[PDB]
């Protein structure tokens, strides 16, 4: 008679494909944190983030974190298709000590840190057509140096400017030079942004410094997948309903265990 109030305590890996977060969140796996290299091109129906997760790369920030977290979560895939942009006149594959991959200075595997090339840095203009029948998700960023000498030593430009535009939208970011508290031995930050390119629309980038260029796109779609914050371990069982407190049988008409759920779950 009374509605269900008990959970098994674990989340069943069936029938829904459950990709677990462990030390990696969806955004760190999206950017390519070295300790998240095992999540490349991996799909899911429900991605579960853990409280023990942590970042171990370059200190960054995402201004609108939630919307970018919900875009990748609803698509249910981290499929990345590399694209060759014409970064003529600049150097690529910038690395840092705060992002160690295989005990070597590295960077976000999905980002290309453009820096100076022989004390020369031209106004980069590149385009990308998007000839497909689906939306593309480009992940780019803007680097915030610590002092004016770092801004000069890396880009040889007194003021940086970055602009990412399409046929519908445009995004302009200005780097803010200043001293940040040291994080993994770095007094600098990076601001991560994104731009959706619809079919038939062209991507455009006019940057005169501090560009964290992308290496490609992700296949985005408003699918059925989602994301959930939970610490309950994943067990070997089947269960049509899933809650942050664990899997739940969907036989009773209601349930009072948590307001968040996924699947054919009776009302909370």
């Amino acid at each position: 008679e009374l509605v269900q109030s008990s959970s098994t305590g674990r989340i069943c890996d069936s029938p829904h494909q459950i990709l677990d977060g462990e030390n990696c969140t969806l955004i760190d796996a999206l950017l390519g944190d070295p300790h998240c290299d095992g999540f490349q091109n991996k799909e899911w129906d429900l991605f579960v983030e853990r409280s023990k997760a942590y970042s171990n790369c370059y200190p960054y920030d995402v201004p609108d974190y939630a919307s970018l977290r919900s875009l990748v979560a609803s698509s249910g895939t981290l499929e990345f298709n590399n694209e060759s942009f014409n970064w003529t006149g600049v150097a690529q594959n910038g690395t840092s000590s705060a992002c160690k991959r295989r005990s070597i200075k590295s960077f976000f595997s999905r980002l290309n840190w453009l820096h100076q090339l022989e004390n020369r840095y031209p106004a980069l203009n590149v385009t990308m057509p998007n000839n497909d029948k689906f939306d593309k998700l480009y992940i780019w960023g803007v680097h915030h140096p610590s002092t004016d000498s770092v801004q000069t030593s890396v880009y040889v430009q007194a003021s940086g400017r970055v602009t990412v535009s399409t046929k519908r939208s445009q995004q302009t970011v200005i780097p803010n030079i200043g001293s940040r508290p040291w994080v993994r031995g770095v007094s600098s930050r990076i601001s991560i942004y994104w731009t959706i390119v619809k079919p038939g629309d062209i991507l455009l980038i006019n940057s005169t410094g501090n560009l964290i260029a992308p290496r490609g796109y992700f296949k985005i779609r408003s699918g059925k997948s989602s994301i959930m914050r939970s610490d309950a371990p994943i067990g070997k069982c089947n269960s049509e309903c899933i809650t942050p407190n664990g899997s739940i049988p969907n036989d009773k008409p209601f349930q009072n265990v948590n307001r968040i759920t996924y699947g054919a779950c009776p009302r909370y």
Epitope: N23, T25, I27, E49, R50, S51, K52, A53, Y54, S55, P59, Y60, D61, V62, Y65, H144, N176, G178, R180, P181, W182, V183, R189, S191, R229
Partner: antibody, heavy 132, light 108 residues
Framework: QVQLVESGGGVVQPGRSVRLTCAGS????????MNWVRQAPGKGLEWLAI????????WYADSVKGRFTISRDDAKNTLFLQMNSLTAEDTAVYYC?????????????????????????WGQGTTVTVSG | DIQMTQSPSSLSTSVGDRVTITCQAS??????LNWYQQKPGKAPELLIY???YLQGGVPSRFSGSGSGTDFSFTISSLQPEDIATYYC?????????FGQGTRLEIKR
Amino acid sequence: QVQLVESGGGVVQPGRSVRLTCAGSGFSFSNFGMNWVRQAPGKGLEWLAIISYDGSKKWYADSVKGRFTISRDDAKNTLFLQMNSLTAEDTAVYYCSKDRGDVWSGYYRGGDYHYYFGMDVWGQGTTVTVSG
Amino acid sequence: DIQMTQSPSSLSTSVGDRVTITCQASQDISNFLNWYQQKPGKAPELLIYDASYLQGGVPSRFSGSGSGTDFSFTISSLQPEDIATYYCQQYNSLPITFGQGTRLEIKR
């Protein structure tokens, strides 16, 4: 000149509310957060509360949570600290300090936006005395 | 809820000697640790930030070191204008907690 001047400190009866005011000039106030710290007479320094740059991130100490509420007025560049239900232990010199947190210095961990840092600019401190 | 222990509670040295006070955290806080000076009757003054760095305007005799759980604060040559009580503050996580405090006195 970067300074933080505060007022609102005085003798107040126990169980009554008090509002502390702190305003500062000489720096971009809407570009950092602020902190509150009190010091009991002869005792050490006890931390109290924090506001981020946009007022969306706030945290109260457990000895203070529920009792006090902290607010921000960027138009006047003024920091506030509401103190409700004052007991005898609240006799302390309440200081006003700076977040040392640039709006952009928000390095992400797992899910913790690590905006909280040390204090680089301090106020003078108003003496708040709770007694009957 | 991270505890900050500060030892000793007080010490006594002469002018010109090397003074070293420390600060032990109850868990790993990386380099998210700061050092302050509180002269008698005044407000705290920031001296060392991020465990290792020295704030501008502070003499070079001051310095800090450490990472993880144990940190050190060192004055290479004590001066009469250094008589104060020094605290250590973390910011690894919330809540931000201070140390007990170490008072500087004179001997002999």
